[PDB]
Amino acid sequence: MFERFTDRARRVVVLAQEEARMLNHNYIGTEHILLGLIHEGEGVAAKSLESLGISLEGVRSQVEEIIGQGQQAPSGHIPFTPRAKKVLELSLREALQLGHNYIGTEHILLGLIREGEGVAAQVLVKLGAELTRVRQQVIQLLSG
Amino acid sequence: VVXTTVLVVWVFV
Amino acid sequence: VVXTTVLVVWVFV
Numbered sequence: 727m728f729e730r731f732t733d734r735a736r737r738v739v740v741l742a743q744e745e746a747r748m749l750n751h752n753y754i755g756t757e758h759i760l761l762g763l764i765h766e767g768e769g770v771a772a773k774s775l776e777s778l779g780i781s782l783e784g785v786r787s788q789v790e791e792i793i794g795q796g797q798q799a800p801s802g803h804i805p806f807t808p809r810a811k812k813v814l815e816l817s818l819r820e821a822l823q824l825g826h827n828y829i830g831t832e833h834i835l836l837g838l839i840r841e842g843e844g845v846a847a848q849v850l851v852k853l854g855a856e857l858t859r860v861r862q863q864v865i866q867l868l869s870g
Numbered sequence: 871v872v873x874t875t876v877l878v879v880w881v882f883v
Numbered sequence: 884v885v886x887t888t889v890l891v892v893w894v895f896v
Binding site: 806 | 884885886888890893894895896
Binding site: 877879880 | 889890891892893
């Protein structure tokens with residue numbers, strides 16, 4: 727109970743909404759959480775990717791090519807898709823597995839992958855970001 | 871250990 | 884345009 731999102735993880739989600747605004751999308755999907763993850767580009771999630779050979783601007787144009795752009799930009803709140811909601815919930819499940827009592831960008835990466843159906847997961851696994859592999863780069867990196 | 875999935879201001883209860 | 888960034892029930896306010 728009471729697991730807190732890190733201030734870095736919170737930014738990823740705030741960023742997720744704006745990525746979708748820039749693209750004129752009227753939703754926040756898993757892809758925009760991955761763009762947010764990329765946009766803050768600083769956490770354990772970003773280093774776990776780069777440390778596996780994955781270029782975060784490669785990821786960004788890969789995702790941007792798949793989802794395109796919207797006609798016009800919407801206002802106020804843009805709703806999170808259910809599967810984007812399920813990423814954040816799988817982040818907590820991935821943090822707990824490791825025995826962590828917080829949710830940071832590392833766990834958001836794992837939940838994006840574990841979600842296993844969205845644009846973000848499809849892009850990630852095409853680039854070796856396999857779950858158990860990313861789990862291990864997360865653990866060795868976190869050791870300290 | 872006890873898991874709650876309400877998202878409430880960035881914390882899961 | 885008012886763009887609050889507190890997350891309430893999955894909605895920003």
